[PDB]
Ligand binder design. Structure first.
Ligand code: GLU
Ligand code: CL
Lengths: 260, 258
């Protein structure tokens, strides 16, 4: 049987090829998660079809209806066999689906326009001349909203009350705001995306300081799925063989536009 | 029934307190994994006893007898219920015990005596005047044994054929060998331990180069153990609450003695 893989279009994980109209099936797509899916399938011995999650979401449980959306929902309700995507291992997701050990690490990080005089979260928190914010929804805003840590609590109070709004609707809007604000806006986002954008023309942004937290992306399967064991062993093997490091270097740096 | 926790004396994870003979039970010990054990037990609602691994090893399988030693062995053969320790999640271990998602990241790294003219693994691999090795019965030695990455493969061939032996039985032995060999021994050990030691007296060692790999430590249980689910959920909760980061900052805090 062909294994149904649910994933999401986000660069550089999964992208439609420029010439996709001339291609078929899995060959329409490229990226880190496309390469990872092929390696997993080869090690586990299965054929697969890449499908893009209908609602474009990662996975959260609606407060009112209690229905899981996104890739997580596709697994929970039995519509897909596996999710191969930048999907973070979190407590509430682990309660409803199985996860491999993580294939990539990340944490919340600061993006500045080059030249901005900020080196750390502590620096941002202690000032207001350089405004700073997050996506208007999702996991990074939630991190600050929920934090009991003093520095991050202070940052949340500032962001929630800052005018005009320091929040943005999309990643692209956050990046454009950093680039157009003459050093007066810093954007808080996942370190993996920050690193990727640091390698996009016009090469005017950079990641600064240590990460604010630590977490990992994992491959997800329905709870109790037999496929989960083999997939987890494959991730651990690909890590030890150095293949995951090779794939991150390929998509972030070999294909990067801003030099070393 | 009281849960039997196996762990290992390795700074700053588990250390015997200076006045331990005046203390009783779990209070004899301090460190990151001692604090983590307390937190896991509280979230999971069990009572527990910290016990130090009988043979002083992390855990590997004998290639001839196929018997596991160290903390891994204590779980496999039923001598302990759980390991709370800097125990690295690896493929060969995952096949025989259960692991939580990782509670801490690390990578293999190089420790030298100050002044040693080595800056990278590639530098080590290209010479023999400065000997280099690692710990027996752990994940670092297994990593070199199995690696086909050119530089690491060459390092393993060197280590296997070096005379006298470049391997050590405990982390403490490896560190003492660096300190006493006048620049002629380098030690391959995890970045977490390397960085803790660099910040403390006698201030005569240092970490050089980037890490060779990236991996994590996990809480381990016998395969199929019912305690596994709850412990894994507690690790994720403690991560999300910021508690793991709090413990890391506490135990790796730089007092500035170096
Ligand atoms: N943490 C390692 C021990 C140290 C090492 O081998 O470098 C293990 O679980 O075996
Ligand atoms: Cl750059």
């Amino acid at each position: 049987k062909t294994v149904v893989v649910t994933t999401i279009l986000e660069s550089p994980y999964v992208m439609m090829k420029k010439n996709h109209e001339m291609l078929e099936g899995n060959e329409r797509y490229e990226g880190y998660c496309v390469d990872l899916a092929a390696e997993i399938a080869k090690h586990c011995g299965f054929k697969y079809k890449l499908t893009i999650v209908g609602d474009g979401k990662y996975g959260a449980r609606d407060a009112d209806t209690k229905i899981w959306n996104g890739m997580v929902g596709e697994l929970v309700y039995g519509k897909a066999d596996i999710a191969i995507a930048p999907l973070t291992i979190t407590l509430v997701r682990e309660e409803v689906i199985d996860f491999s050990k993580p294939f990539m690490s990340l944490g919340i990080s600061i993006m500045i326009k080059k030249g901005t005089p900020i080196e750390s979260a502590e620096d941002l928190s202690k000032q207001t001349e350089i405004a700073y914010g997050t996506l208007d929804s999702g996991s990074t805003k939630e991190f600050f909203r929920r934090s009991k840590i003093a520095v991050f609590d202070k940052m949340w109070t500032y962001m929630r009350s800052a005018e005009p709004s320091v929040f943005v609707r999309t990643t692209a809007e956050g990046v454009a705001r950093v680039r157009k604000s003459k050093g007066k806006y810093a954007y808080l986002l996942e370190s993996t995306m920050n690193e990727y954008i640091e390698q996009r023309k016009p090469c005017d942004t950079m990641k600064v300081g240590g990460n604010l937290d630590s977490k990992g992306y994992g491959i997800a399967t329905p709870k109790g799925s037999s496929l989960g064991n083999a997939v987890n062993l494959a991730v651990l093997k690909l890590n030890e063989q150095g293949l995951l490091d090779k794939l991150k270097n390929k998509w972030w740096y070999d294909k990067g536009e801003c030099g070393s």
